[PDB]
Amino acid sequence: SHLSARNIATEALQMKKLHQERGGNPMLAQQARRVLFATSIAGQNLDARSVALLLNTAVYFGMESDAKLVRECIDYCLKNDKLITVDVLPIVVTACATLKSRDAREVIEMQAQKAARNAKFLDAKDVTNIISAFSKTGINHEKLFAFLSRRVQTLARVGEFEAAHLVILANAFSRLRYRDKFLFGAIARRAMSLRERVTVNELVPLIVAFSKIGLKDPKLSKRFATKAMEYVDQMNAEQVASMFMAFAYFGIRYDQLFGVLTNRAVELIDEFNAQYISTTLNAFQRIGINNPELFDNLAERALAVVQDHDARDISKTVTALAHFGLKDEELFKRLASHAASIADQFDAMGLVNTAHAFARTNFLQQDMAVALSERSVYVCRLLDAGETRRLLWALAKFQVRDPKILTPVFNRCLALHYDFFADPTGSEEIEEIFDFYGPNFCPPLYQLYISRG
Amino acid sequence: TALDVAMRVNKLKRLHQTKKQVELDAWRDLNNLTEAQINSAEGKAVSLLLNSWAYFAKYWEKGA
Amino acid sequence: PSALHLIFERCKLNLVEFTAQDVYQICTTAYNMDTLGMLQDPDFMRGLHDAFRRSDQTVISPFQANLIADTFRKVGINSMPKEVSVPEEDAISPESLILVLRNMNITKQRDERKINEVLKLMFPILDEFSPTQLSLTVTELARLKSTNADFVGKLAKRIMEYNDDLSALDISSAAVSLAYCPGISHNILYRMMQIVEERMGEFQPEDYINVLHALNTLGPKFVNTFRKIVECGLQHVENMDAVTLTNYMVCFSTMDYKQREHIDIYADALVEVATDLSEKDLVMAFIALQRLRLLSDTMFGTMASCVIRYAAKMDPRNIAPIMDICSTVPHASDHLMKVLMDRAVECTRILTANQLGDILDILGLYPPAREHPLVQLFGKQARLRLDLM
Amino acid sequence: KSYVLKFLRGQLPEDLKDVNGALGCLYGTLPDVDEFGQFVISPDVVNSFHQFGYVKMPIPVLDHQQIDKLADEVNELANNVEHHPKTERLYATSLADLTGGPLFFCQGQWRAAWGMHDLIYLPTITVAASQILNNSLVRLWYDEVFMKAARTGPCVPWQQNYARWQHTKPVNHVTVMIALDTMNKDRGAPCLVPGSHRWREGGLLPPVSYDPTKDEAHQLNTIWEIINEEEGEMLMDTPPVTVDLRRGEALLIHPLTLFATHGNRSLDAVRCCFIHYMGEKTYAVQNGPLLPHTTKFQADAMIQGPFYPVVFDPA
Amino acid sequence: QVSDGGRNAMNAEPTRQKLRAMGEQIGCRLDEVEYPALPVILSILDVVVTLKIYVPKKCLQVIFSQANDMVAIVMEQKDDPITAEEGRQLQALLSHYGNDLAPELSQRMKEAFREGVLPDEAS
Amino acid sequence: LHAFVRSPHYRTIPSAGPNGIVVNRDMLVHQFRDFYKTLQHCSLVDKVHLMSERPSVEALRVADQMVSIGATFLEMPLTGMEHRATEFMESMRYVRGAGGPSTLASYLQDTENCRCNSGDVVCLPNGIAVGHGPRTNAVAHTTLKQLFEVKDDQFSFDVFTLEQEGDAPPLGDYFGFAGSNVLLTWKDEHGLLAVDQYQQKQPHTEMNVVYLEPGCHFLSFYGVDHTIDVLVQKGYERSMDSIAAAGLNPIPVQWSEMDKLGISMRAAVLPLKFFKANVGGMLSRNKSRGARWQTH
RNA sequence: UAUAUAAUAGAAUAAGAUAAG
RNA sequence: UUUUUUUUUUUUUUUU
């Protein structure tokens, strides 16, 4: 299909929308990738809108910073800085979020300065899009965030935002770790002033964001709990697990809401997937509520479906089961045998959590232990002293005694010896570690350990 | 020494701008080019030779 | 062709030292004569492009580099001429920064940092500019869509100072370029329009076109100059080009000219020769005639007949205006309307959200569109496009 | 599975090996399982390969635009001012010391680049490679790219491919060379012995000592030093042959054929790609991984996994 | 930071007075300083006027003399960034305080605005 | 058509009005919210721009900065508003950000002793009317006559001087135009005097005149674009019936707290017309007006 | 008596969960 | 539902 570059960017944006919020059809992604592979804007002149759309659609579909189209778009964004108005700013920022080159950093910083300068002349759409775009880049421009929060408060004092805008705003301001109680109070007031215009689908994400941001005020949680209790009947498994997680994050011991939520969850036990079960178990671990019938139902369902268990799901499930105490025999075997197959997907801390959960329950399988131990050499660099201690104790309980695996863990322990030997807890854990490995395996850590510091 | 023959054929093209020993000429001249002369030609000689070849093939009967 | 084959082989293997001028000559003879299979052979063109990319393009004009890039792009090789740097301290001359701007404009690759740098090296040496150099740099800055209005205002003041040393074309180009600048002051614009109307008896049709564009951009705040040019051009109305008559119509619509006596003369002159208009000019004439309330029984028929020969291959952005004009007017336009609906049915794939919405809106109350097959196709396309609306 | 954020639902995995098949880039997509019959090589080509140990395919395997894309990707791989993303995804690169040199070599590129990933699954070369290995399964082992300097590109000395592939048990391999540029004796065309693939009944000549501080003459003349008298008698009748390759030309090479690459004395860089295909029933020799940071095999375990994907399966 | 309808709205008026007194403490010592750029002068004068702080005529004379000497660079040298709006604000301040303070400055600003030396904020 | 309004600073709202009438801050912000909603719902303003709060109560009077005469955005002199210079610059920044004019015409800031006040300028068919009085001396009138008065045929733009007493509000408060040839005034001495004066100035044109309750602030978006809505204060219901009988659409608006603070509905908004700068002799897209396919 | 020139523009449009200090 | 915003800041004493 031969088309102009603008006529290609339009269909590219449409394809991105259809693949994003209308089911992830692989054929659409493949067609878009093939179309964008041969697309170039070297000669033709385009608006900033078309170039921004092309860059965003290319970056969304997996194109890294080494491609020709991405390089041309970034060059255009670097040269013609004054043509990237507020309308086409969030698109460029969102596109550059994933890219971590030098040009991407420069473009992001320039757009941040532009947004912080013009933060008082925007509208609801522009402010919402700008804050949502700057949420994804991980930038830490606190002055810009303060300016945008002030503009949000002034613009919402006159009832401008609505349900979708409030959800996006809360998610963006919670992901950036901006604990402004006044801003979230204004967002909550605008939500409650939207009577019956905040549906369940627009109510659950708001509660999740308000839980994640970590607000000190406990009076706000009560209204969310009551409104959720009113809306329980109209929910699938996704939102049930979502509010389990959210009200675990709040940390307030509610009774009627938890009972009705458990009733609805056991009602929909035939629709739960691996991620929902893991989220529910993790939420119950965080809140401390012990519900053994629900745990039995979730364990049975997790036994029913095991292929869907991702590394995060496996880690959360085993950690919750080990902490609670309840544990199955064949479910653990299936989970360990599956994690052996996908041991190359565990993260820096998920691997430690899974290994320590399996070690703490006295469940040792050779295949899983070998896979996790061999994998525990590309992740020792990204480990805190507590996580390193947990992984070392798991290895000691696993009886690995392999220098190629042990020496990076001991290098990490030595490089973090102060936070390793001064942990308020874990003294008995380190004692057992050193009892297993003996004094001659690693001299310097022994010398430090017989000095208590 | 491809530049000398290139300039000679350029002069022949100039004369033809305003057929025996005209189109027949610059055909032996261009085929005169040996392997060494072609392999020791700068950019200017190559460009002039290509221009002359294009014009001659335009006004030659069947070949190029 | 043993010698020709050897030359082609040596060019393909990148064993020939090519200068920029030699590559330019080869490109010219390949694009003009093409008796040999130069453009058809991919390997030879790839080798020539590799030689041109690594060459020194400072020894060729921006037009020559643009032609080389165009020739390379005509075959598939994505080529782009090099960006020239700002001249060093010794080479800072009024004739070199203008060259930088000209190359930036011609090659269609503009850097705003370079524009700022050459605008900050021009102020101290701004006293060394020739009268024509100011009129050149004003248009060069205008064509780059620069937002610096103070520099253009200073340039315009200097251009006013050297009034007697400039031709009519330079004055008209300076006026239109000044009008295109958004942030320029209004006193300067008034002075420039006074200057234009004082030297207005020497204008060629190109200068008329430039002045009309400047007036249309400026708006109804400059009615007196438009009145003067309307009164002057009344002699030339019969012997006048069609494009400038269309521009007269556009200016008449913009200024809300209440003197409806000359409007009839100009509109009749336009409708006499409306057969010699392209897509955009014909569409603009239609819009201007509608907004002036001039669509009569007969001139509408002639303009519709002129549109018929263009309606088959109209751009998707030129379908809604004609539909709106037909909708507002109470005359007979069934044939043109059907042709436009067929063209829209053809173009439904590439129509954007706004154009599709406008096309659907104009045909909302049209009776013949009820049974036309565009309804289902447009409904499905609108459902697909609903994310972008 | 887990929950993927909305703006990350189209991203490709970090390791491109995680993609089960081939992306839509370059050629459209792999044909149907019963539509692979149009890429069969002629029996005369098979006989020529079995007699000489090498053969060039009758037609170029890639159109010109695909060649430009591949050359651009090779250029971006060798970037120095801004290092390529997914650089740590390669087995080895010439820029590990961040300096570089006249010759740039990159291994394991297929895990860190589009297009190059699709080049592995090309039916035109995979079907021919399968036909070479007695019409059996083919598994990609690894690929590399060489890019020579503008005017001082060095010449690779005489070499046998299997001299380094000692971890694979049987002699079941094939090499495909794709020329992204036009090559010549002065620009980097490969020069190889017409019959060295059947010397010593399949044995390997000892490693050749070369001085990296001198010209090409001794580099190309070490072959006499490394051979014996009888091999010299065989070589005298049939001298080594340099094959000139154009854009997209593919060259099938036996793992035991002695081949070298001339240096670059042209006015710009030259790029070439090597892809090494095994066959089925190819086994390991020793414990541990064959390539850096790969799956650890047993003593005689058959070679398989995600690092060595199956690219063509008859029946 | 004082509210006219807050907890101590009745006590808000004295507080302002107190602040005003402190403002006058800086107001009388406004001749010793050396202004580097016009925006500093504009900010100080705007703060004084908005809060209705009392400033002696001598301090105003010194301030406007320094402002005149500062603006006696941008227009006659013309080699080198005072925007037009800043000049308008300065003219308004001078008119509010009286043109007898700096008779030169009023005519200089008027001729500058007629000439158009001061650029716009958009530029 | 873009309307610019400024959000009221909650903390600095005065406890009592200028005369001594107490006000409610919460009711004030509630009425401002309702006013913003009913201004968005006007169906004629393309976009409503909200300005950030400023630590002053008189900064709510955003209409004391500019008058739109014909096609010019004239700037009022800075004579008694020396504390509002920065406010005016910020408002101009807001206007620039919305695609409006780069700057304003300074035809009045340079004229000597030209003391003028907005609201005294009221639009009318092909002209304006200015109110001679305490806040607008004769020099402003003669400058306006010089700049805008035209007495030519088919191009006449005539400006009328309407003398008013020394205890009258701005002419725009109690005198205005609406709909197709509709006039609105208060039923007091000022309204009758202004109506009679304009009748004398334009005798051959017959106009519909509507009388309203005194002290009833209204707002009609009169201009080239035909409109029917007329915002009117909620408390008075006789004026609503009078407006409805004339054939116009009245919209009640709660405006008690501003009345206690002395700010009118006319002085709280700044209507402006922005036209796209067409380049290359092109015409932009207008709004859908009229009924399509009258004859099918 | 010389080997060579290259400039016309149009579109207003919002997706939404990272095991934190 | 009533808490907050508007500088050219440049003065940290290590041998890393």
mmCIF file with all atom_site columns, N, CA and C in Angstrom, chain E residues 9-44:
data_model
loop_
_atom_site.group_PDB
_atom_site.id
_atom_site.type_symbol
_atom_site.label_atom_id
_atom_site.label_alt_id
_atom_site.label_comp_id
_atom_site.label_asym_id
_atom_site.label_entity_id
_atom_site.label_seq_id
_atom_site.pdbx_PDB_ins_code
_atom_site.Cartn_x
_atom_site.Cartn_y
_atom_site.Cartn_z
_atom_site.occupancy
_atom_site.B_iso_or_equiv
_atom_site.pdbx_formal_charge
_atom_site.auth_seq_id
_atom_site.auth_comp_id
_atom_site.auth_asym_id
_atom_site.auth_atom_id
_atom_site.pdbx_PDB_model_num
ATOM 1   N N  . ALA E 1 9  ? -9.832  36.890 61.422 1.00 0.00 ? 9  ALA E N  1
ATOM 2   C CA . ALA E 1 9  ? -10.094 37.921 60.423 1.00 0.00 ? 9  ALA E CA 1
ATOM 3   C C  . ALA E 1 9  ? -10.133 39.312 61.041 1.00 0.00 ? 9  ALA E C  1
ATOM 4   N N  . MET E 1 10 ? -10.600 39.415 62.288 1.00 0.00 ? 10 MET E N  1
ATOM 5   C CA . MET E 1 10 ? -10.595 40.705 62.970 1.00 0.00 ? 10 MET E CA 1
ATOM 6   C C  . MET E 1 10 ? -9.172  41.178 63.241 1.00 0.00 ? 10 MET E C  1
ATOM 7   N N  . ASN E 1 11 ? -8.253  40.244 63.468 1.00 0.00 ? 11 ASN E N  1
ATOM 8   C CA . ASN E 1 11 ? -6.855  40.563 63.730 1.00 0.00 ? 11 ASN E CA 1
ATOM 9   C C  . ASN E 1 11 ? -6.016  40.648 62.457 1.00 0.00 ? 11 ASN E C  1
ATOM 10  N N  . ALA E 1 12 ? -6.634  40.490 61.283 1.00 0.00 ? 12 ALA E N  1
ATOM 11  C CA . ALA E 1 12 ? -5.875  40.529 60.036 1.00 0.00 ? 12 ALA E CA 1
ATOM 12  C C  . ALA E 1 12 ? -5.375  41.934 59.728 1.00 0.00 ? 12 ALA E C  1
ATOM 13  N N  . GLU E 1 13 ? -6.191  42.953 60.008 1.00 0.00 ? 13 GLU E N  1
ATOM 14  C CA . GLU E 1 13 ? -5.802  44.327 59.693 1.00 0.00 ? 13 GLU E CA 1
ATOM 15  C C  . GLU E 1 13 ? -4.539  44.779 60.415 1.00 0.00 ? 13 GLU E C  1
ATOM 16  N N  . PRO E 1 14 ? -4.370  44.567 61.727 1.00 0.00 ? 14 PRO E N  1
ATOM 17  C CA . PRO E 1 14 ? -3.089  44.945 62.348 1.00 0.00 ? 14 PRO E CA 1
ATOM 18  C C  . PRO E 1 14 ? -1.892  44.258 61.720 1.00 0.00 ? 14 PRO E C  1
ATOM 19  N N  . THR E 1 15 ? -2.011  42.965 61.397 1.00 0.00 ? 15 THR E N  1
ATOM 20  C CA . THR E 1 15 ? -0.888  42.233 60.821 1.00 0.00 ? 15 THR E CA 1
ATOM 21  C C  . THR E 1 15 ? -0.375  42.918 59.563 1.00 0.00 ? 15 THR E C  1
ATOM 22  N N  . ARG E 1 16 ? -1.274  43.200 58.612 1.00 0.00 ? 16 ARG E N  1
ATOM 23  C CA . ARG E 1 16 ? -0.882  43.949 57.423 1.00 0.00 ? 16 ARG E CA 1
ATOM 24  C C  . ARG E 1 16 ? -0.145  45.221 57.808 1.00 0.00 ? 16 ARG E C  1
ATOM 25  N N  . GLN E 1 17 ? -0.712  45.990 58.744 1.00 0.00 ? 17 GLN E N  1
ATOM 26  C CA . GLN E 1 17 ? -0.054  47.210 59.196 1.00 0.00 ? 17 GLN E CA 1
ATOM 27  C C  . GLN E 1 17 ? 1.370   46.918 59.637 1.00 0.00 ? 17 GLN E C  1
ATOM 28  N N  . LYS E 1 18 ? 1.543   45.911 60.500 1.00 0.00 ? 18 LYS E N  1
ATOM 29  C CA . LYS E 1 18 ? 2.881   45.527 60.924 1.00 0.00 ? 18 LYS E CA 1
ATOM 30  C C  . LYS E 1 18 ? 3.770   45.271 59.719 1.00 0.00 ? 18 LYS E C  1
ATOM 31  N N  . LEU E 1 19 ? 3.296   44.442 58.783 1.00 0.00 ? 19 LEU E N  1
ATOM 32  C CA . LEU E 1 19 ? 4.083   44.157 57.590 1.00 0.00 ? 19 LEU E CA 1
ATOM 33  C C  . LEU E 1 19 ? 4.412   45.439 56.846 1.00 0.00 ? 19 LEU E C  1
ATOM 34  N N  . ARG E 1 20 ? 3.421   46.324 56.692 1.00 0.00 ? 20 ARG E N  1
ATOM 35  C CA . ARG E 1 20 ? 3.675   47.581 56.002 1.00 0.00 ? 20 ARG E CA 1
ATOM 36  C C  . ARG E 1 20 ? 4.796   48.348 56.683 1.00 0.00 ? 20 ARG E C  1
ATOM 37  N N  . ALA E 1 21 ? 4.772   48.403 58.019 1.00 0.00 ? 21 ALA E N  1
ATOM 38  C CA . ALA E 1 21 ? 5.848   49.069 58.740 1.00 0.00 ? 21 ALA E CA 1
ATOM 39  C C  . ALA E 1 21 ? 7.193   48.473 58.358 1.00 0.00 ? 21 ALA E C  1
ATOM 40  N N  . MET E 1 22 ? 7.289   47.140 58.376 1.00 0.00 ? 22 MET E N  1
ATOM 41  C CA . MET E 1 22 ? 8.544   46.500 58.005 1.00 0.00 ? 22 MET E CA 1
ATOM 42  C C  . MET E 1 22 ? 8.921   46.838 56.573 1.00 0.00 ? 22 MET E C  1
ATOM 43  N N  . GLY E 1 23 ? 7.933   46.909 55.678 1.00 0.00 ? 23 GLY E N  1
ATOM 44  C CA . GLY E 1 23 ? 8.221   47.336 54.320 1.00 0.00 ? 23 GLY E CA 1
ATOM 45  C C  . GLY E 1 23 ? 8.856   48.710 54.283 1.00 0.00 ? 23 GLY E C  1
ATOM 46  N N  . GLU E 1 24 ? 8.314   49.650 55.065 1.00 0.00 ? 24 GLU E N  1
ATOM 47  C CA . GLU E 1 24 ? 8.898   50.985 55.109 1.00 0.00 ? 24 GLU E CA 1
ATOM 48  C C  . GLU E 1 24 ? 10.329  50.941 55.617 1.00 0.00 ? 24 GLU E C  1
ATOM 49  N N  . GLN E 1 25 ? 10.651  49.958 56.462 1.00 0.00 ? 25 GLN E N  1
ATOM 50  C CA . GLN E 1 25 ? 12.016  49.822 56.955 1.00 0.00 ? 25 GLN E CA 1
ATOM 51  C C  . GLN E 1 25 ? 12.986  49.589 55.805 1.00 0.00 ? 25 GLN E C  1
ATOM 52  N N  . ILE E 1 26 ? 12.550  48.851 54.782 1.00 0.00 ? 26 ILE E N  1
ATOM 53  C CA . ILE E 1 26 ? 13.378  48.699 53.591 1.00 0.00 ? 26 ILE E CA 1
ATOM 54  C C  . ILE E 1 26 ? 13.161  49.877 52.650 1.00 0.00 ? 26 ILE E C  1
ATOM 55  N N  . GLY E 1 27 ? 11.984  50.503 52.721 1.00 0.00 ? 27 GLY E N  1
ATOM 56  C CA . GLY E 1 27 ? 11.669  51.580 51.794 1.00 0.00 ? 27 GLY E CA 1
ATOM 57  C C  . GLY E 1 27 ? 12.602  52.768 51.921 1.00 0.00 ? 27 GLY E C  1
ATOM 58  N N  . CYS E 1 28 ? 12.934  53.152 53.155 1.00 0.00 ? 28 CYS E N  1
ATOM 59  C CA . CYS E 1 28 ? 13.790  54.317 53.355 1.00 0.00 ? 28 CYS E CA 1
ATOM 60  C C  . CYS E 1 28 ? 15.234  54.040 52.955 1.00 0.00 ? 28 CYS E C  1
ATOM 61  N N  . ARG E 1 29 ? 15.690  52.795 53.074 1.00 0.00 ? 29 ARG E N  1
ATOM 62  C CA . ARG E 1 29 ? 17.031  52.419 52.627 1.00 0.00 ? 29 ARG E CA 1
ATOM 63  C C  . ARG E 1 29 ? 16.958  51.762 51.249 1.00 0.00 ? 29 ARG E C  1
ATOM 64  N N  . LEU E 1 30 ? 16.568  52.566 50.261 1.00 0.00 ? 30 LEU E N  1
ATOM 65  C CA . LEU E 1 30 ? 16.484  52.104 48.883 1.00 0.00 ? 30 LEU E CA 1
ATOM 66  C C  . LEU E 1 30 ? 17.394  52.868 47.932 1.00 0.00 ? 30 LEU E C  1
ATOM 67  N N  . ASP E 1 31 ? 18.194  53.809 48.433 1.00 0.00 ? 31 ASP E N  1
ATOM 68  C CA . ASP E 1 31 ? 19.122  54.554 47.594 1.00 0.00 ? 31 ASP E CA 1
ATOM 69  C C  . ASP E 1 31 ? 20.525  53.964 47.585 1.00 0.00 ? 31 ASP E C  1
ATOM 70  N N  . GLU E 1 32 ? 20.891  53.198 48.615 1.00 0.00 ? 32 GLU E N  1
ATOM 71  C CA . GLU E 1 32 ? 22.248  52.677 48.723 1.00 0.00 ? 32 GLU E CA 1
ATOM 72  C C  . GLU E 1 32 ? 22.538  51.572 47.714 1.00 0.00 ? 32 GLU E C  1
ATOM 73  N N  . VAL E 1 33 ? 21.508  50.934 47.164 1.00 0.00 ? 33 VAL E N  1
ATOM 74  C CA . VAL E 1 33 ? 21.691  49.771 46.302 1.00 0.00 ? 33 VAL E CA 1
ATOM 75  C C  . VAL E 1 33 ? 22.082  50.201 44.895 1.00 0.00 ? 33 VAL E C  1
ATOM 76  N N  . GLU E 1 34 ? 22.541  49.243 44.090 1.00 0.00 ? 34 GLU E N  1
ATOM 77  C CA . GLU E 1 34 ? 22.916  49.473 42.698 1.00 0.00 ? 34 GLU E CA 1
ATOM 78  C C  . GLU E 1 34 ? 22.189  48.445 41.841 1.00 0.00 ? 34 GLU E C  1
ATOM 79  N N  . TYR E 1 35 ? 21.186  48.894 41.097 1.00 0.00 ? 35 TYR E N  1
ATOM 80  C CA . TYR E 1 35 ? 20.354  47.982 40.319 1.00 0.00 ? 35 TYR E CA 1
ATOM 81  C C  . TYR E 1 35 ? 21.090  47.518 39.069 1.00 0.00 ? 35 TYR E C  1
ATOM 82  N N  . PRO E 1 36 ? 21.257  46.212 38.862 1.00 0.00 ? 36 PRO E N  1
ATOM 83  C CA . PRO E 1 36 ? 21.939  45.734 37.653 1.00 0.00 ? 36 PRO E CA 1
ATOM 84  C C  . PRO E 1 36 ? 21.042  45.731 36.426 1.00 0.00 ? 36 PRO E C  1
ATOM 85  N N  . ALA E 1 37 ? 19.758  45.426 36.606 1.00 0.00 ? 37 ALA E N  1
ATOM 86  C CA . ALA E 1 37 ? 18.834  45.329 35.486 1.00 0.00 ? 37 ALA E CA 1
ATOM 87  C C  . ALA E 1 37 ? 17.482  45.907 35.874 1.00 0.00 ? 37 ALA E C  1
ATOM 88  N N  . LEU E 1 38 ? 16.721  46.294 34.849 1.00 0.00 ? 38 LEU E N  1
ATOM 89  C CA . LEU E 1 38 ? 15.400  46.877 35.069 1.00 0.00 ? 38 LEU E CA 1
ATOM 90  C C  . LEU E 1 38 ? 14.429  45.971 35.822 1.00 0.00 ? 38 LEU E C  1
ATOM 91  N N  . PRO E 1 39 ? 14.358  44.655 35.573 1.00 0.00 ? 39 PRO E N  1
ATOM 92  C CA . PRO E 1 39 ? 13.370  43.839 36.300 1.00 0.00 ? 39 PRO E CA 1
ATOM 93  C C  . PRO E 1 39 ? 13.467  43.936 37.812 1.00 0.00 ? 39 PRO E C  1
ATOM 94  N N  . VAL E 1 40 ? 14.665  44.117 38.372 1.00 0.00 ? 40 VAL E N  1
ATOM 95  C CA . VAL E 1 40 ? 14.787  44.287 39.819 1.00 0.00 ? 40 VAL E CA 1
ATOM 96  C C  . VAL E 1 40 ? 14.059  45.550 40.265 1.00 0.00 ? 40 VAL E C  1
ATOM 97  N N  . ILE E 1 41 ? 14.276  46.651 39.540 1.00 0.00 ? 41 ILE E N  1
ATOM 98  C CA . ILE E 1 41 ? 13.599  47.906 39.852 1.00 0.00 ? 41 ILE E CA 1
ATOM 99  C C  . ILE E 1 41 ? 12.093  47.738 39.731 1.00 0.00 ? 41 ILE E C  1
ATOM 100 N N  . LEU E 1 42 ? 11.644  47.090 38.654 1.00 0.00 ? 42 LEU E N  1
ATOM 101 C CA . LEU E 1 42 ? 10.217  46.890 38.441 1.00 0.00 ? 42 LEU E CA 1
ATOM 102 C C  . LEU E 1 42 ? 9.586   46.048 39.538 1.00 0.00 ? 42 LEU E C  1
ATOM 103 N N  . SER E 1 43 ? 10.238  44.964 39.955 1.00 0.00 ? 43 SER E N  1
ATOM 104 C CA . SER E 1 43 ? 9.737   44.135 41.042 1.00 0.00 ? 43 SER E CA 1
ATOM 105 C C  . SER E 1 43 ? 9.669   44.895 42.359 1.00 0.00 ? 43 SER E C  1
ATOM 106 N N  . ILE E 1 44 ? 10.719  45.648 42.698 1.00 0.00 ? 44 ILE E N  1
ATOM 107 C CA . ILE E 1 44 ? 10.714  46.393 43.955 1.00 0.00 ? 44 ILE E CA 1
ATOM 108 C C  . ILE E 1 44 ? 9.604   47.440 43.949 1.00 0.00 ? 44 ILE E C  1
#
